[PDB]
Ligand binder design. Sequence first.
Ligand SMILES: *[C@@H]1O[C@H](CO)[C@@H](O)[C@H](O)[C@H]1NC(C)=O
Lengths: 41, 47
Amino acid sequence: ITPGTNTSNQVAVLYQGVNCTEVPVPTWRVYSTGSNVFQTR
Amino acid sequence: RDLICAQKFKGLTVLPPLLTDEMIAQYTSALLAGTITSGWTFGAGPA
Ligand SMILES: *[C@@H]1O[C@H](CO)[C@@H](O)[C@H](O)[C@H]1NC(C)=O
């Protein structure tokens, strides 16, 4: 999720089909993870 | 396993809709309230 490169560079990652417990954070090298997690449907 | 979980292991997924059933129900309730209490005036301008 990006609000646009012309405004800022902060992004939000939405892992599809997880439960905030099997996040990976040669093993899908870690990206910028957010400390504010929220489980959705 | 069931059929839904057996398809996720083959790459086929189902994305959830944006508007849930509760929001559609609230929209229908608002439409019914506008139709009963105002008629057709809420579709043109103010109720
Ligand atoms: C997801 O996590 C919640 C709370 O941790 C739990 O109640 C639920 O059963 C979990 N669902 C699955 C599919 O693991």
